[PDB]
Design a protein around this ligand. Structure first.
Ligand SMILES: Nc1ncnc2c1ncn2[C@H]1C[C@H](O)[C@@H](COP(=O)(O)OP(=O)(O)OP(=O)(O)O)O1
Ligand SMILES: [Ca+2]
Ligand SMILES: [Mn+2]
Length: 430
DNA sequence: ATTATGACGCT
DNA sequence: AGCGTCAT
């Protein structure tokens, strides 16, 4: 009852860019705007692999991971932009730099956690408290929430989508008690007002549109964000959770999309997040471990405590390349040349990072895959990173992997390598 | 031949 | 430390 925590203490948003790499290319090349288009890497094999798709192209069934030649079968007029190639490999610098543009704007509003190249969590609890004081018990106008959906509404007592959106928003607002400065629903609503302002700033200052979720924690914020994309934001209230979760496949919740989620489904014989409420905390801990069990018990009730971490910059800087099929590296000279290519890109990025962010990496991690292993990585070895020098780093990487080679012949490399990976880690201030 | 990343958990 | 999971 009165002592039962409801996980309504925070206001958390997740802001996620719409079809991000496509928007970056569309800003650069106006011919691509408002077109079915996709971003591809490489080209020789089956037209290249698609890694981002405009909403116009999605209407034709084009998806990520599709080969461009196959996408063209669904969408003959599909336009394509290619990822830059440098030193023999795809180079994602343009998108990393565009990401920084967006993250720096968001950081003006609140402390952010960089969650990926195109999304960040926002802890808006303090910003909401301040805006609530400014408002002075003044009601929130629908005009302040022009792209906001209220999940679960309208209900009860209608043909167009925008019409439905406004209907739901009006029901929500009509209900709100603006007298209570600690009402969680009011706090979320003010959060949504701030996120409208954040999203407007991002679009004004970069040209990029985005979607957002506003709720009381990171998992619900992220779930919310995807409900109404693109170019819209969704508020998921604590009260909306039972209905929302009653038909929500377990795999849709962040961290449950893989083996653990499949095990929850199999072991418990359920399908939807809401069905988890019928198990005790101890029951869930017995199957999934102490940490997961406690997390699931709270999460299926809409409660999670994972903090928005104050981290705007990536913790690692890495360079990787696959060598599939017949292109697998089978000579020592090959392995060395590609280690150097990777190290040269890594040095470039590290040197820029040091100048921009006043820090230095101290550990180099080297990872490879060998033909036949189905695992992402076959072997991971670390060594000291003492100088930002590509020739040194590539020589050091070779040293820590060279024993991998089962070939008797010095020159030959066996089994061939199907992946190389260099990663700079363990930053220290400088 | 679903590539190039990046964070975090386990032991 | 080195490996595995989950994610975009
Ligand atoms: N599996 C991947 N491999 C390589 N790049 C990826 C992969 N997934 C995502 N990316 C890149 C390209 C995306 O534009 C960008 C952001 O990913 P993501 O948010 O999942 O989709 P998206 O921004 O392209 O479309 P959406 O509007 O559905 O969010 O990160
Ligand atoms: Ca996105
Ligand atoms: Mn994303």
């Amino acid at each position: 009852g009165p002592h039962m925590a409801t996980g309504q203490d925070r206001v958390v948003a997740l802001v996620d860019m719409d079809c991000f790499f496509v928007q970056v290319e569309q800003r650069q090349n106006p011919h691509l705007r408002n077109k079915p288009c996709a971003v591809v890497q490489y080209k020789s094999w089956k037209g290249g692999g698609i890694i981002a798709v405009s909403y116009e192209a999605r209407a034709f069934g084009v998806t990520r991971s599709m080969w461009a030649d196959d996408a063209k079968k669904l969408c003959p007029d599909l336009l394509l932009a290619q990822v830059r190639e440098s030193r023999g490999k795809a180079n994602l610098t343009k998108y990393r730099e565009a990401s920084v543009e967006v993250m720096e704007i968001m950081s003006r509003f609140a402390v952010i956690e960089r969650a990926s190249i195109d999304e960040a969590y926002v802890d808006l609890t303090s910003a909401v408290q301040e805006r609530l004081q400014k408002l002075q018990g003044q009601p929130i106008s629908a005009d302040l929430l022009p792209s906001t959906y209220i999940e679960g509404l309208p209900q009860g007592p209608t043909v167009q989508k925008e019409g439905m959106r406004k209907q739901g928003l009006f029901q929500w607002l009509d209900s709100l008690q603006i007298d209570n400065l600690t009402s969680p629903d009011l706090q979320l609503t003010v959060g949504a007002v701030i996120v409208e302002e954040m999203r407007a700033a991002i679009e004004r200052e970069t040209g990029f549109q985005c979607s957002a979720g506003i709720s009381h924690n990171k998992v619900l914020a992220k779930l919310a964000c995807g409900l109404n994309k693109p170019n819209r934001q969704t508020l998921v209230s604590h009260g909306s959770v039972p209905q929302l979760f009653s038909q929500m496949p377990i795999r849709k919740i962040r961290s449950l999309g893989g083996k653990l989620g499949a095990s929850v489904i199999e072991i418990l014989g359920i399908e939807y997040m809401g069905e988890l409420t019928q198990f005790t905390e101890s029951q869930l801990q017995s199957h999934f471990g102490e940490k997961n069990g406690s997390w699931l018990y709270a999460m299926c009730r809409g409660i999670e405590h994972d903090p928005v971490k104050p981290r705007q910059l990536p913790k690692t800087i890495g360079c990787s390349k696959n060598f599939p099929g017949k292109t697998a590296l089978a000579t020592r000279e090959q392995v060395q040349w590609w280690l150097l290519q990777l190290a040269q890109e890594l040095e470039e990025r590290l040197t820029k990072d040091r100048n921009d962010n006043d820090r230095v990496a101290t550990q180099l991690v080297v990872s490879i895959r060998v033909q036949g292993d189905k695992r992402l990585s076959s072997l991971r070895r670390c060594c000291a990173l003492t100088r930002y020098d590509a020739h040194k780093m590539s020589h050091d990487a070779f040293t820590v992997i060279k024993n991998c080679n089962t070939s008797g012949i010095q020159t030959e490399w066996s089994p061939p390598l199907t992946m190389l990976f260099l990663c700079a880690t363990k930053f220290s201030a400088s």
